[PDB]
Write an enzyme that holds these catalytic residues in place. Sequence first.
Site, PDB file in Angstrom:
ATOM      1  CG  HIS A   1     -46.823  79.882 -81.740  1.00  0.00           C
ATOM      2  ND1 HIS A   1     -47.446  81.105 -81.861  1.00  0.00           N
ATOM      3  CD2 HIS A   1     -47.709  79.068 -81.119  1.00  0.00           C
ATOM      4  CE1 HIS A   1     -48.656  81.035 -81.335  1.00  0.00           C
ATOM      5  NE2 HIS A   1     -48.841  79.810 -80.877  1.00  0.00           N
ATOM      6  N   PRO A   2     -44.626  79.597 -78.849  1.00  0.00           N
ATOM      7  CG  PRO A   2     -44.576  81.075 -77.072  1.00  0.00           C
ATOM      8  CD  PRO A   2     -44.991  80.979 -78.502  1.00  0.00           C
TER       9      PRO A   2
ATOM     10  CG  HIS B   1     -49.790  80.064 -70.572  1.00  0.00           C
ATOM     11  ND1 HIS B   1     -51.136  79.959 -70.297  1.00  0.00           N
ATOM     12  CD2 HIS B   1     -49.647  79.738 -71.879  1.00  0.00           C
ATOM     13  CE1 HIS B   1     -51.779  79.586 -71.389  1.00  0.00           C
ATOM     14  NE2 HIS B   1     -50.899  79.446 -72.363  1.00  0.00           N
ATOM     15  CD  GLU B   2     -46.770  77.500 -73.878  1.00  0.00           C
ATOM     16  OE1 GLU B   2     -47.018  76.280 -73.969  1.00  0.00           O
ATOM     17  OE2 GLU B   2     -47.274  78.354 -74.636  1.00  0.00           O
TER      18      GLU B   2
ATOM     19  CD  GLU C   1     -56.181  77.491 -74.884  1.00  0.00           C
ATOM     20  OE1 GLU C   1     -55.642  78.383 -74.195  1.00  0.00           O
ATOM     21  OE2 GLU C   1     -55.765  77.158 -76.013  1.00  0.00           O
TER      22      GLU C   1
ATOM     23  CE  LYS D   1     -67.568  94.372 -85.710  1.00  0.00           C
ATOM     24  NZ  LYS D   1     -66.408  93.945 -84.880  1.00  0.00           N
TER      25      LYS D   1
ATOM     26  CG  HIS E   1     -59.071  81.035 -84.831  1.00  0.00           C
ATOM     27  ND1 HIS E   1     -58.049  81.958 -84.767  1.00  0.00           N
ATOM     28  CD2 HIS E   1     -58.873  80.181 -83.799  1.00  0.00           C
ATOM     29  CE1 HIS E   1     -57.269  81.675 -83.740  1.00  0.00           C
ATOM     30  NE2 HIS E   1     -57.746  80.602 -83.136  1.00  0.00           N
TER      31      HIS E   1
ATOM     32  CE1 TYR F   1     -58.326  80.888 -78.051  1.00  0.00           C
ATOM     33  CE2 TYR F   1     -59.747  80.549 -79.944  1.00  0.00           C
ATOM     34  CZ  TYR F   1     -58.513  80.441 -79.341  1.00  0.00           C
ATOM     35  OH  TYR F   1     -57.461  79.885 -80.031  1.00  0.00           O
TER      36      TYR F   1
HETATM   37  C1  LIG Z   1     -60.029  64.094 -83.483  1.00  0.00           C
HETATM   38  O1  LIG Z   1     -59.588  64.619 -84.682  1.00  0.00           O
HETATM   39  C2  LIG Z   1     -59.235  66.007 -84.541  1.00  0.00           C
HETATM   40  C3  LIG Z   1     -58.741  66.477 -85.890  1.00  0.00           C
HETATM   41  O2  LIG Z   1     -58.736  65.416 -86.835  1.00  0.00           O
HETATM   42  C4  LIG Z   1     -58.214  66.263 -83.420  1.00  0.00           C
HETATM   43  O3  LIG Z   1     -58.411  67.624 -83.056  1.00  0.00           O
HETATM   44  C5  LIG Z   1     -57.199  68.347 -82.800  1.00  0.00           C
HETATM   45  O4  LIG Z   1     -56.925  68.464 -81.398  1.00  0.00           O
HETATM   46  C6  LIG Z   1     -55.722  69.187 -81.100  1.00  0.00           C
HETATM   47  C7  LIG Z   1     -55.558  69.164 -79.600  1.00  0.00           C
HETATM   48  O5  LIG Z   1     -56.255  70.248 -79.001  1.00  0.00           O
HETATM   49  C8  LIG Z   1     -55.812  70.605 -81.653  1.00  0.00           C
HETATM   50  O6  LIG Z   1     -54.568  71.261 -81.431  1.00  0.00           O
HETATM   51  C9  LIG Z   1     -54.824  72.573 -80.894  1.00  0.00           C
HETATM   52  O7  LIG Z   1     -54.842  73.526 -81.943  1.00  0.00           O
HETATM   53  C10 LIG Z   1     -55.066  74.875 -81.517  1.00  0.00           C
HETATM   54  C11 LIG Z   1     -55.207  75.735 -82.754  1.00  0.00           C
HETATM   55  O8  LIG Z   1     -54.028  76.517 -82.887  1.00  0.00           O
HETATM   56  C12 LIG Z   1     -53.673  76.595 -84.283  1.00  0.00           C
HETATM   57  O9  LIG Z   1     -53.005  77.818 -84.552  1.00  0.00           O
HETATM   58  C13 LIG Z   1     -51.743  77.991 -83.880  1.00  0.00           C
HETATM   59  C14 LIG Z   1     -51.237  79.382 -84.209  1.00  0.00           C
HETATM   60  O10 LIG Z   1     -52.011  80.323 -83.472  1.00  0.00           O
HETATM   61  C15 LIG Z   1     -50.789  76.883 -84.338  1.00  0.00           C
HETATM   62  O11 LIG Z   1     -49.538  77.036 -83.687  1.00  0.00           O
HETATM   63  C16 LIG Z   1     -51.397  75.515 -83.994  1.00  0.00           C
HETATM   64  O12 LIG Z   1     -50.517  74.471 -84.400  1.00  0.00           O
HETATM   65  C17 LIG Z   1     -52.786  75.361 -84.615  1.00  0.00           C
HETATM   66  O13 LIG Z   1     -52.570  75.238 -86.023  1.00  0.00           O
HETATM   67  C18 LIG Z   1     -53.887  75.296 -80.635  1.00  0.00           C
HETATM   68  O14 LIG Z   1     -54.072  76.634 -80.201  1.00  0.00           O
HETATM   69  C19 LIG Z   1     -53.784  74.359 -79.427  1.00  0.00           C
HETATM   70  O15 LIG Z   1     -52.654  74.719 -78.635  1.00  0.00           O
HETATM   71  C20 LIG Z   1     -53.110  75.132 -77.330  1.00  0.00           C
HETATM   72  O16 LIG Z   1     -52.566  74.287 -76.332  1.00  0.00           O
HETATM   73  C21 LIG Z   1     -51.133  74.330 -76.210  1.00  0.00           C
HETATM   74  C22 LIG Z   1     -50.735  73.289 -75.185  1.00  0.00           C
HETATM   75  O17 LIG Z   1     -51.073  72.008 -75.704  1.00  0.00           O
HETATM   76  C23 LIG Z   1     -50.720  75.748 -75.814  1.00  0.00           C
HETATM   77  O18 LIG Z   1     -49.311  75.811 -75.677  1.00  0.00           O
HETATM   78  C24 LIG Z   1     -51.184  76.729 -76.897  1.00  0.00           C
HETATM   79  O19 LIG Z   1     -50.804  78.055 -76.550  1.00  0.00           O
HETATM   80  C25 LIG Z   1     -52.691  76.617 -77.127  1.00  0.00           C
HETATM   81  O20 LIG Z   1     -53.297  77.173 -75.960  1.00  0.00           O
HETATM   82  C26 LIG Z   1     -53.723  72.886 -79.855  1.00  0.00           C
HETATM   83  O21 LIG Z   1     -52.438  72.676 -80.412  1.00  0.00           O
HETATM   84  C27 LIG Z   1     -56.131  70.579 -83.142  1.00  0.00           C
HETATM   85  O22 LIG Z   1     -56.352  71.900 -83.621  1.00  0.00           O
HETATM   86  C28 LIG Z   1     -57.371  69.735 -83.406  1.00  0.00           C
HETATM   87  N1  LIG Z   1     -57.636  69.657 -84.833  1.00  0.00           N
HETATM   88  C29 LIG Z   1     -58.519  70.442 -85.460  1.00  0.00           C
HETATM   89  C30 LIG Z   1     -58.656  70.226 -86.937  1.00  0.00           C
HETATM   90  O23 LIG Z   1     -59.179  71.288 -84.862  1.00  0.00           O
HETATM   91  C31 LIG Z   1     -58.413  65.403 -82.170  1.00  0.00           C
HETATM   92  O24 LIG Z   1     -57.188  65.342 -81.444  1.00  0.00           O
HETATM   93  C32 LIG Z   1     -58.870  63.993 -82.537  1.00  0.00           C
HETATM   94  N2  LIG Z   1     -59.221  63.220 -81.355  1.00  0.00           N
HETATM   95  C33 LIG Z   1     -58.498  62.176 -80.919  1.00  0.00           C
HETATM   96  C34 LIG Z   1     -57.266  61.850 -81.709  1.00  0.00           C
HETATM   97  O25 LIG Z   1     -58.822  61.526 -79.928  1.00  0.00           O
END
Ligand SMILES: *[C@@H]1O[C@H](CO)[C@@H](O[C@@H]2O[C@H](CO)[C@@H](O[C@@H]3O[C@H](CO[C@H]4O[C@H](CO)[C@@H](O)[C@H](O)[C@@H]4O)[C@@H](O)[C@H](O[C@H]4O[C@H](CO)[C@@H](O)[C@H](O)[C@@H]4O)[C@@H]3O)[C@H](O)[C@H]2NC(C)=O)[C@H](O)[C@H]1NC(C)=O
EC number: 3.4.17.23
Lengths: 49, 596
Positions: B327-328, B356-357, B384, B463, B487, B497
């Site tokens: 997964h990228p 994109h990445e 995003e 719907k 989700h 989104y």
């Molecule tokens: C406060 O506390 C919360 C939780 O305790 C923290 O919240 C997290 O923040 C991070 C940063 O955004 C979140 O990470 C994001 O998750 C998204 C959800 O994707 C899920 O599903 C995919 C599969 O489709 C998995 O691979 C992934 O690991 C997740 O399980 C991701 O989509 C996000 O990625 C996006 O950005 C990257 C670049 O960084 C792109 O490459 C991707 O394509 C995508 O666009 C991202 O990884 C995380 O989900 C949050 N947690 C929760 C529970 O929601 C806070 O960080 C924290 N605050 C602080 C510490 O200050």
Amino acid sequence: LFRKSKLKPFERDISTEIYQAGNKPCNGVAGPNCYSPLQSYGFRPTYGV
Amino acid sequence: STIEEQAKTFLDKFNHEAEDLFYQSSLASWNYNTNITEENVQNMNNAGDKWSAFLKEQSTLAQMYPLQEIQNLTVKLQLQALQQNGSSVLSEDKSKRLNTILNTMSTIYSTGKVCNPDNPQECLLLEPGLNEIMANSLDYNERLWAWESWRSEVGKQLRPLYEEYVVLKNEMARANHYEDYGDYWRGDYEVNGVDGYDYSRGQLIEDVEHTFEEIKPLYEHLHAYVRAKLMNAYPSYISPIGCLPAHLLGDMWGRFWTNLYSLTVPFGQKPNIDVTDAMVDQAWDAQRIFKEAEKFFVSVGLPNMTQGFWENSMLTDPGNVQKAVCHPTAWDLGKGDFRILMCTKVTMDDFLTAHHEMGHIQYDMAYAAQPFLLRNGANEGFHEAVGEIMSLSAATPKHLKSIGLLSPDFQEDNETEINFLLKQALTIVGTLPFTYMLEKWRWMVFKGEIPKDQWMKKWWEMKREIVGVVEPVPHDETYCDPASLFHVSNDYSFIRYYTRTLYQFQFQEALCQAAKHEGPLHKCDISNSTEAGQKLFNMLRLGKSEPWTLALENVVGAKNMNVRPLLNYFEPLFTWLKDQNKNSFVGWSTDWSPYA
Ligand SMILES: *[C@@H]1O[C@H](CO)[C@@H](O[C@@H]2O[C@H](CO)[C@@H](O[C@@H]3O[C@H](CO[C@H]4O[C@H](CO)[C@@H](O)[C@H](O)[C@@H]4O)[C@@H](O)[C@H](O[C@H]4O[C@H](CO)[C@@H](O)[C@H](O)[C@@H]4O)[C@@H]3O)[C@H](O)[C@H]2NC(C)=O)[C@H](O)[C@H]1NC(C)=O
Ligand SMILES: *[C@@H]1O[C@H](CO)[C@@H](O[C@@H]2O[C@H](CO)[C@@H](O[C@@H]3O[C@H](CO)[C@@H](O)[C@H](O)[C@@H]3O)[C@H](O)[C@H]2NC(C)=O)[C@H](O)[C@H]1NC(C)=O
Ligand SMILES: *[C@@H]1O[C@H](CO)[C@@H](O[C@@H]2O[C@H](CO)[C@@H](O)[C@H](O)[C@H]2NC(C)=O)[C@H](O)[C@H]1NC(C)=O
Ligand SMILES: *[C@@H]1O[C@H](CO)[C@@H](O)[C@H](O)[C@H]1NC(C)=O
Ligand SMILES: *[C@@H]1O[C@H](CO)[C@@H](O)[C@H](O)[C@H]1NC(C)=O
Ligand SMILES: *[C@@H]1O[C@H](CO)[C@@H](O)[C@H](O)[C@H]1NC(C)=O
């Protein structure tokens, strides 16, 4: 990381005492508003410039 | 002395230990993701436990400073974030019960499996077989049955657990000062303390509804054109005025309409734009693609990657015993370490995905100077959007011609633009009503206005109202259709989104305007331009230090999201679709039901 005042040019300081920040003197023990003055670096090969 | 100095003293300590602990946890996560072993899982658990525990005491200690004595408005943001995101209020028995339920949600979704009727011999999982069947197979019975089978075997089990889940989340918000767990999500966009830039939580709902009102004519015209074309594939099943069946959208839930491009090509005789063979002839490898992506960022003025990125990041699948997730992702381990994790093939999609990445990495490096608690985007949508605006320019024919993959003999006329716009339309426009529908229903269910016995009742009624899709098989309250979504089951906010898509077209229009570009909007390039690069970089380096309304102003010049740039992007497609819909009825009928 914490000192009461500044340093004169070409000076050194080695004393290690708990830096009180709050009004209450905590008698030189670790706790709230009482932090150790000497912090620590961390070094690993994977860091960036 | 005063509270301000003590708070600054505490922050100057928290930042130091937070950096080191974050590095240890993040590095452990990277090690497992590139090396799948049991001991790596243990390392993640240990590192995660230390980081999670450390946040707990810091949240407890931060309580001693009341927030009404801070006027810098910068310390207040750090204190608010620290206090909120690590504070626990439920009792121990309720806390572990919620954790057990959440673990059950993820476990059942990953382990869920359905297979052929009246045959327990061989069975398959959702990712390998189910996705392929709904994307490629054209059998009416197979698609309808598989769509019904997965929901029956997943939603029914997840229904009672969701009912317990929605409760416990509510007292979590009730214990805090939020009205409900729905308002807890809407608090991300909340802005306070700044005159002329304040944004209220309730304003988001009105803004979302108003924005969706204007984009209705484009969606229904596309819906009418889709219905007419799909009549050729399944004439008997599809009604000229009814809603489309829910099992004929090319995917599991109808989130994206990309798979219908072949069945709904406007001009199939004309060649499609493709460069995969060109890269094959030129013998392109993974490093060459990323170097080309890097050169694009340099051409606008942004600095390029460090030496650590090239040595540490991996771009090819190791294979053999070494197994890893493909997964990228864009990793930011902190303390000056940036890496990209993805498996690369010689395809156009991977070429665009590299751009994109790489956008996320550049955004991460932009705010490296900010404090630890402020190293993030202005909201959940900016991050995003930044990584998506650049994929638009990379796919333009001009950029391909300049690089040299596309032959100079290529020409542009009616069909080339129309086919390109429609391909983009089925991916961007189609998903907007689905995202808004899911969020609005989930807002209502958390509000508590809907009783449990009408959960499935109201779900399908709206719907057919907004999305205009009718289920092919009736369902009672035993099923829990929303729980089948990834989700929804994993407790992730879904409104991001919808704000992201409308954000990206505001950015692209502004940058193209600054680049002194003329002509159609969809043919725009910013490779040579540097004024656009410096204007974008000014907002990127801000981080979370400023309200998102101000950041939006500094780029486009407005204090709110708008829909005009999105419509202007697809305007040529809108006129052509109006011409094609002269003899086709516009609007779906909610009375029709496929099951008699
Ligand atoms: C406060 O506390 C919360 C939780 O305790 C923290 O919240 C997290 O923040 C991070 C940063 O955004 C979140 O990470 C994001 O998750 C998204 C959800 O994707 C899920 O599903 C995919 C599969 O489709 C998995 O691979 C992934 O690991 C997740 O399980 C991701 O989509 C996000 O990625 C996006 O950005 C990257 C670049 O960084 C792109 O490459 C991707 O394509 C995508 O666009 C991202 O990884 C995380 O989900 C949050 N947690 C929760 C529970 O929601 C806070 O960080 C924290 N605050 C602080 C510490 O200050
Ligand atoms: C709110 O608090 C922050 C953090 O305490 C204040 O930021 C601080 O701003 C001052 C000047 O505005 C910075 O001083 C500068 O230091 C650099 C060296 O780093 C020096 O070269 C400059 O000449 C200047 O003296 C200070 O560094 C900075 N703090 C941090 C941690 O970077 C901010 O000013 C406060 N808000 C208000 C309205 O005062
Ligand atoms: C940005 O500038 C570079 C530098 O000139 C352009 O690269 C040239 O593109 C032309 C095509 O118009 C080629 O004939 C040259 O061989 C290219 N030179 C080099 C050194 O690559 C690039 O095309 C410009 N970007 C845009 C979008 O026009
Ligand atoms: C992965 O983990 C194994 C098990 O400890 C170890 O031997 C190996 O060096 C690690 N790295 C790679 C690339 O296999
Ligand atoms: C981009 O990378 C090259 C090395 O390939 C380097 O010489 C150049 O300085 C970099 N660009 C900038 C703006 O530093
Ligand atoms: C194709 O583009 C030309 C531009 O000169 C225009 O005159 C013509 O009407 C277009 N055809 C269609 C079907 O849109």
